[PDB]
Design a protein around this nucleic acid. Sequence first.
RNA 1: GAAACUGCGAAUGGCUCAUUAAAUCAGUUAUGGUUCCUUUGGUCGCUCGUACUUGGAUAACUGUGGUAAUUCUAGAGCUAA
RNA 2: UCGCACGCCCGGCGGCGACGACCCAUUCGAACGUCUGCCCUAUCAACUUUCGAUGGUAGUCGCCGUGCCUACCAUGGUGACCACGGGUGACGGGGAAUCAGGGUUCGAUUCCGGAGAGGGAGCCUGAGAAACGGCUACCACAUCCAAGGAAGGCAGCAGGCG
RNA 3: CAGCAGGUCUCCAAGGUGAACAGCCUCUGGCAUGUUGGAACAAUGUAGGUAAGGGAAGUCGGCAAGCCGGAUCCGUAACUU
Lengths: 131, 143, 63, 60
Amino acid sequence: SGAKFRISLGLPVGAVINCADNTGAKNLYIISVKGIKGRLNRLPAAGVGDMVMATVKKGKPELRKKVHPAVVIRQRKSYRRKDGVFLYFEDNAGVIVNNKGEMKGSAITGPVAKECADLWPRIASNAGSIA
Amino acid sequence: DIQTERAYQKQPTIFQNKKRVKLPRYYKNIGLGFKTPKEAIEGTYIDKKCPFTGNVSIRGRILSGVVTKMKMQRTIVIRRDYLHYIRKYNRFEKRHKNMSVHLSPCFRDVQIGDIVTVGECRPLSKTVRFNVLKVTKAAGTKK
Amino acid sequence: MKVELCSFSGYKIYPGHGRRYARTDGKVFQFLNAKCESAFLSKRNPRQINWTVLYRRKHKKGQ
Amino acid sequence: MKLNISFPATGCQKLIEVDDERKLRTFYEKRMATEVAADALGEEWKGYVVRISGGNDKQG
RNA sequence: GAAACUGCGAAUGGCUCAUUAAAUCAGUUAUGGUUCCUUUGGUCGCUCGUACUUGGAUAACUGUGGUAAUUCUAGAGCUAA
RNA sequence: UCGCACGCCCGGCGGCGACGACCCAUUCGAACGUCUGCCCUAUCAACUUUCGAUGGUAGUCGCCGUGCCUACCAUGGUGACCACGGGUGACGGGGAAUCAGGGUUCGAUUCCGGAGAGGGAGCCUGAGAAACGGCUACCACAUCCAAGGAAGGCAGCAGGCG
RNA sequence: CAGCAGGUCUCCAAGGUGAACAGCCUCUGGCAUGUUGGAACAAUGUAGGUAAGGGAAGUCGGCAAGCCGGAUCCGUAACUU
């Protein structure tokens, strides 16, 4: 039902993004993006609303030293919405999620982009503000 | 000479600005049979925290003490050696509760070792609630 | 078609132009170009900037 | 969109729903206590000057 | 006499001891350095300048409902302190 | 302002109250103050001080007195009569148990005084709250949901889980 | 092997900024830009720079480039001869 409508993506592999939820994690080390086929010497990048593979560097130790799936909810790179507005959220943020789309946490600090809400309806449930 | 502070220094009761042709002074007795010193009347100073020429009254308790420090301006530190009996070990313990009392410059020749009776009043600062009432001379040492 | 007023300068922003900015605590600011964008990100008060509409509402200029 | 009109001289009121955005162009972008020429509301509403006061949204 | 407008109480009581080592707390004291709901004892024609009672607003009620959801709320007609 | 009996003269004079009131005293208090009394620790000996720590002058707030707070003056104030710091399976007291006596241990538990309703921070009304079976935010938790939003604080009464 | 960016021992040393005989600008003094000029501003070059987002994921290797940098007031650990 809901398509992607490709946006500007600027978070490659190796970026550390802050945790905007209540799982106790602080940052998320991006290790790979789920869904990218790849290209020779092209780093897999992620925009807002993509299921991404992350890893906690500092924070709660029971979440560290293992691999967690994540969904990016905020980004620094200005991307173009289909009506023609360029949006950025002064930070790069992501949440810890499983493969089905269920949050480990329960609350979201900061806004969530509009295209992140409709592909992931459960993320929009705990989002305090949209767009 | 005098009135080196920021505002005009005078007793709030007195008034000398009426039309003319020595400054008047107001004082008060303290009660409980303590006399009023001579220089608190004779002098030209003011002090709002003095129980003789200031807006403060001695009430509650009257105790005594011995002076040990005077390195402040217009107040001193006293020593209060009191004995407490211990019911278990039937002997006495040497304890003191030293605290500062406000010494007005009504008294001039105040030395170390002088027994000074002191009176409870309203709190004038963070921890002082006492003023010097009258000063007795030390054991000898007139010179 | 919703033309909407710029957050820093105060000029009307047509739907095809401008830039959208939303800070972390949740409020959204609008910039017509990077000229207005660069000033707001560095804590510049528009009331001290001569060419904005709020300067003219503060100095009672024009009209 | 519904129009809960009211008439203070007699005290009567009725609810009328309008399914045309072209019908409602003269009402849009108006504040509290604004005289709006309601002569475009229909054939039999001629010369009616109505005052807009607002109501509830789609959530209540 | 339902309900509603208006006063008082809901800062009482019950529970627990997380916190706290001259701090709480316990005994003598002072507000001559301040307040005080209610109750009681009093001043309440002391002032020198339409009163046979002034004014206009509302809840309840009639009617429209909006919402998925609430001890949510408004528009029109009022009316009393 | 309202309610109940009801009267005197030839329209004018009077009763019993309720309720709330400008102010002074009463009561319940509240808070500020004095002296005295507290477990252990030197493998805590020097502590504190322009980031008021100690006094004065003059101000602000306050219910008033005060570095409670503000600008300037003095660098003082305390400690071997144990200060400062740390821990305390420490709310304290009246008291309870064992006891010849001397004590020891316990004391959250029906009385008194202090604190609090998960955590601090802030607050209207109300005399009286920084209340929480009152609010405003955040944090941790956490309910419904139609996904737009709303809504909660049993260290109360019973009761349920760990 | 030359009118060769190489090498070759010494005297004097203005003003400003600035700790300084450091770097930069100016005066006295010296010169025509160093074996030639004109026209365009293609690629690839050499020497300088700038880059939205990420920040070493590049590479044998943080190579290169980049960050800090002066002064004043604080403050300054492990170890130790």
